[PDB]
Each structure stands twice: as C-alpha cells, then as structure tokens.
C-alpha cells in the first residue's frame, strides 16, 4: 500500500495510507481521523498548487513518499 506524508507549517508530520484512486476528499477524511481537523478547515498544497477535493492523487501525479502541505482554512464566522 502507498504511503504519503502530510506536513504542517508547525513542523508536525503524519503518514497516511492511501491509494492512487483516493480522492483528495478521501485524504482529508483520513487527516480528520488522525488529527481531528474537520475537512472543511483543511487546505492541501502540492508543488505550489492547492489541490481540489473532486480529483484523485493520480490526477495530481502524487506518488508514494510524496509530501503534502496541510494549511488551515480560517475564513470567518
């Protein structure tokens, strides 16, 4: 199984077990199970581009051992 890494700007890193067909929406659900951050507060960035929930890791050419930046989404409310 493929393993990706998600790294926050604070320096904390988590390893996720994912697959190429997984949607970004599915990855955010895995980050919620491990860090408790609701998916609506999550920004994932790879290669200087913010990822979209509808597409898959394969659509962005994210490969195992690739690292994703997790950035919180604090708008207002």
């Amino acid at each position: 199984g493929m393993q990706i890494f998600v790294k926050t700007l604070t320096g904390k890193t988590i390893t996720l077990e994912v697959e190429p067909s997984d949607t970004i929406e599915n990855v955010k659900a895995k980050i919620q199970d491990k860090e408790g951050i609701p998916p609506d507060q999550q920004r994932l960035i790879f290669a200087g581009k913010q990822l979209e929930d509808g597409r898959t890791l394969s659509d962005y050419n994210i490969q195992k051992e690739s690292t994703l930046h997790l950035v919180l989404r604090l708008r207002g409310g």
């Binding site: 700007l9 408790g36 989404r73 604090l74 409310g77």
Partner: protein
C-alpha cells in the same frame, strides 16, 4: 447607533461578486487607535462582508489599531512559505482564509515591538499563558480552529480602564448596541467548545 445597524446590513449583501475591492464592507469605528481608543470608547474596527474569508486581515488591523495590512501582505506570506503563485494567492485568501503561521509571518515583518506567538495549543494552556502575561500586554489575536469551530480570527484590545474588548469583524457576530463587548481573551478561550489543540494566540 442606527448608522451602525445599517452598515451591518450592508455587509450582508452578497449580490455583487466578491473581489479585492469589496471584501471590506465598512467600519464600526474608522479612526486610528494605535494605543488608546476614541472618546466613544471604541477601537479601530473593520466589518467584513459575510462571504469573505478575510477575518485574519481585519483582526490584524484591530490588533495594530489602523489599516496597516491588506491582501498584499498575506499573499506575499503564503507565496513565500508554501510556494503558491502571488496573484493566485490573493484570490485564494478571499476564499480560504489564513493559517496561523501566515499571520505570524505578516506581523513580524513590522520591525519594532516583538510579537509572541503560540500556535497549535489547547485552549486551556493558552488561557493560562494569557493570564500569566495579562498585566504586560494590551492586544491579542485569537485564531479559532478544530472541531466545534467554524475557523475564525478575533482580536482583543485593552483600554485605559484595563478592560479587555473583543473586536470581531464577522458582521453576524456584531451587535450594534455593544459592538466591542467586555470580555478577556483568556476567558473567551476558556469558554470555547473545542477540546483539541488547534487554537492559537499572538500577543504584544
């Protein structure tokens, strides 16, 4: 006090598409308050359009007491730290807001009085910090996040009476008869619903 009530209604009108030129809807108090508040007791206070995700910039200005920060500062910070394109990042902040480390980076550009940040901490330990340093500070930015939060930035400001005032830019959470309520940032944090460690503070 009705002029403020109608200004709050204005910030609810999302008819026109959001843009770099209309995300700021108005002001509760438009005059500068770098130190003390005005004669009406109010600090500089911006009102954001409801659909804008720019709470961080408006709170940062309440933190400073003037219109010191705009989209250029936060976009430049996001481009430098995560590699986003600068023009893109300006549109993305309108949509997706600002992470606590971006805010930290923006406030520390201003050389002079230092800003102390504590990021990714529980509310209980941040409140204890705010109680420990209370006498030595007069302004705070509170980033809210985690389960039970919508994701929001609030500013706090201390007056000559040594009373704290909550300055919230989201127009749904402003009451025209008391737009800057009396509440300490420490107690504000102690009453948050979230239970994990995704809160953040920046004080001076």
């Amino acid at each position: 006090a009705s002029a403020l009530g109608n200004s709050l209604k204005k910030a609810l009108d999302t008819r026109e598409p959001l843009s770099e030129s209309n995300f700021l809807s108005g002001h509760v108090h438009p005059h500068d308050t770098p130190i003390h508040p005005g004669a009406n007791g109010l600090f500089y206070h911006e009102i954001q359009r409801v659909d804008s995700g720019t709470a961080a910039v408006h709170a940062a200005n309440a933190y400073s007491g003037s219109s010191q920060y705009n989209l250029h500062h936060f976009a430049n910070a996001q481009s430098n730290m995560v590699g986003l394109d600068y023009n893109e990042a300006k549109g993305l902040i309108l949509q997706d807001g600002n992470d606590p480390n971006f805010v930290k980076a923006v406030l520390n550009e201003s050389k002079g009085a230092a800003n102390t940040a504590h990021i990714a901490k529980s509310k209980t330990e941040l409140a204890d910090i705010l109680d420990h340093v209370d006498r030595d500070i007069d302004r705070v930015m509170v980033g809210l996040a985690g389960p039970g939060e919508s994701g929001h930035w609030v500013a706090f400001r201390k007056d000559g009476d040594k009373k704290w005032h909550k300055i919230d830019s989201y127009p749904r959470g402003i009451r025209a008869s008391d737009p800057q309520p009396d509440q300490s940032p420490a107690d504000f944090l102690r009453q948050r619903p979230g239970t994990e460690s995704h809160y953040s503070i920046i004080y001076r």
